[PDB]
Structure 1
Amino acid sequence: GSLTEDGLSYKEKFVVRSYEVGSNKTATVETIANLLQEVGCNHAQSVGFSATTTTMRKLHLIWVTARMHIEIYKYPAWGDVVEIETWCQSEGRIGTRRDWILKDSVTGEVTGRATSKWVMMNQDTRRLQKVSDDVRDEYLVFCPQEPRLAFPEENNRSLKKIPKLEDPAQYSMIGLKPRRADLDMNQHVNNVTYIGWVLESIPQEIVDTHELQVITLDYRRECQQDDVVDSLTTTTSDSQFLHLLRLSGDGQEINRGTTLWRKK
């Protein structure tokens, strides 16, 4: 992959692998989400980051995902080339935004888009911070100056408030645990695992008849290596669902979400 001419965005091609596809022989939304993260990491590495910046590594600050929104129009097939472009933007004290556009490399057609909201947080205390007084001028040089939005439409799905699912759930998958393949290099559960856990309470009949078009997920609290998760889904409708992940015991909320599915 490479920074573009202007140095303000990053592009990378991926060939979809045999083990990356589901029952329709196209990429899973988990494979997509993993590629979004990989191109995000190659963007950071290209400009000298990693997404830590000098004064963050100093005060022990990290970027952590508050929110992920992905919309897929077509899932690439096994052996297809998908091109992903990614860029970041400041949203003032709130935090930072990373957006993605996915294209069919051959047709140059847009096959998906994604946006995500990141916040600061001290790694040790896990206390949510606001973007420094201004000292966070270290990274504005690497973002477009004028707004560039994968989701430009005022009042659009990517920004909607998600409510808390109420017991009893219509569906549940309980006792989900992460294995070592689910940890990142710093031994924290991978953001993509939570996507997989949310989708595990969708009934097989839906996954067999429908394709996933939209997923929005809030990250409230991290699941540790030795935590156990329950995944809850209720139909609210195309088929739409409301999602909740919570710790198997006390029922502490770790994620909430919505998905939208189209008949195949």
Structure 2
Amino acid sequence: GSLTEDGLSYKEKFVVRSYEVGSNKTATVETIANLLQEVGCNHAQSVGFSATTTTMRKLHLIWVTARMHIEIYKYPAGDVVEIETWCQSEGRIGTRRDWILKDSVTGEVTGRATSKWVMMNQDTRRLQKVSDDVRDEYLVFCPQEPRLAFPEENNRSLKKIPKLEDPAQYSMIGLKPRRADLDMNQHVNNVTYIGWVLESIPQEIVDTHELQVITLDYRRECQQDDVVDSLTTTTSNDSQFLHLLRLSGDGQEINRGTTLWRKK
């Protein structure tokens, strides 16, 4: 894995592992999400991060995921998959990180993703707009012209996700994160919330359909000692669902999103 010739993006190849695939012998959506996350960690490291600047570490600010959008066309089965990631400023809202998944053999694009990141205070959990001086510190590592993965006029990543009404059609109650789900800072990995959202999708839908799109807004972080409830409702060959992750007790909303499924 290394930065491209200009140094404004990063590339990395991955061989799909045995424990990374599902019932259809192809890489699960959580494995793909982990590979996108891994390539983004190494891009921050290659340009000198450990991804907070010296100014961000002084004021106690961190980058947090606010929205994640992942569209897959072909899930890699032993296959080699190369991912090209890059970041771009989104004015004073925050940052945007895009990915392009390509099959290393056929060279075709087998998927792509985009995420919106915001600047949150490490301790008070309070959000704030990216100040001018902090913004230009990472501008030197971003393409100046707009390079989006999803350039489409009314693209399916900038649409507002509604709140699921009760009763939910499907549900999966009592979901708790384990030590494997926690990261190096002891927080529940963002990829775990993707797997929790999909736990409410029926087994019949998973066995007769494949996941094409997944848009997910991160509202609140799930602490290790918290228990979640996953809810789903069909809103529609293609099938659409409305998802909502919320705490078991107080019913505190932690996530909301939508998924699109295509026939096999």
**TM above 0.5, one fold?**
yes
Alpha-carbon distance in 2 for matches of 1:103, 1:2:
16
Partner Cα distance (2:50, 2:242) in 1: 34
Same amino acid, percent of matched pairs: 100
Deviation, 1:154, is 1.7
What is the deviation of 1:155? Answer: 1.7
* Paired residue secondary structure (1:112): strand
SS of the equivalent of 2:194 reads helix
d(CA) in 1 for partners of 2:93 and 2:135? 12
Give, in angstroms, the shift of residue 241 of structure 1: 0.1
Query: How far off its partner does 1:206 sit?
Result: 0.3
Distance 2:132 2:155 in 1: 30
SS in 1 for 2:74: coil
Distance across 2 between alignment mates of 1:133 and 1:152: 26
Aligned-residue offset at 1:138: 0.6
Q: Could you give the per-residue CA deviations for residues 32-65 of structure 1, whole angstroms, max 9, x where no partner exists? A: 0000000000100000012111100110100000
Q: Could you say what secondary structure the match of 1:207 adopts?
A: helix
Q: CA deviation at 1:93?
A: 1.0
Q: Is the partner of 1:7 in helix, strand or coil?
A: coil
Are 1:57 and 2:57 counterparts?
Answer: yes
1:134 CA drift (Å): 3.3
Q: Secondary structure at the match of 1:137?
A: helix
Instruction: Please tell me whether the aligned partners of residues 240 and 260 of structure 2 are also in contact (alpha carbons under 8 angstroms).
Output: yes
Q: How many residues align?
A: 263
The corresponding residue for 1:102 is: 101
Deviation at 1:87, TM superposition (A): 0.2
In structure 2, list runs of 5 or more residues that go unmatched.
none
Q: Distance in 2 between matches of 1:133 and 1:36?
A: 28
TM-score under structure 1 length normalisation: 0.99
Ranges of 4+ aligned residues in structure 1 off by more than 3 Å = none
Q: Distance in 2 between matches of 1:247 and 1:64?
A: 20
> Could you tell me whether the CA contact under 8 Å between 2:56 and 2:134 is conserved in 1?
no
Distance across 2 between alignment mates of 1:51 and 1:230:
31
Is the deviation greater in 248-257 or in 131-140?
131-140
Give the deviation of 1:197 after TM superposition.
0.2
Alignment of 1:45-194 (within 5 A): 45-77=45-77, 79-194=78-193
Deviation at 1:92, TM superposition (A): 1.3
1:129 to partner: Cα distance? 1.1
Tell me the alpha carbon deviations over residues 111-132 of structure 1, each in whole angstroms, 9 at most, x when there is no partner.
Answer: 0000000000100000001101
Taking structure 2 as the reference length, what is the TM-score of the superposition? 0.99
SS in 1 for 2:75: coil
Q: What is the CA–CA distance in structure 2 between the aligned matches of 1:169 and 1:84, rounded to whole Å?
A: 36
| CA deviation profile, 1:198-238 (whole Å, cap 9, x unmatched) | 00000000000000000000000000000000000000000
Distance in structure 1 (CA, Å) of the matches to 2:257 and 2:28: 18
Local SS of the residue matching 1:180: coil
Change beyond 3 A, Cα 1:59–1:71: same
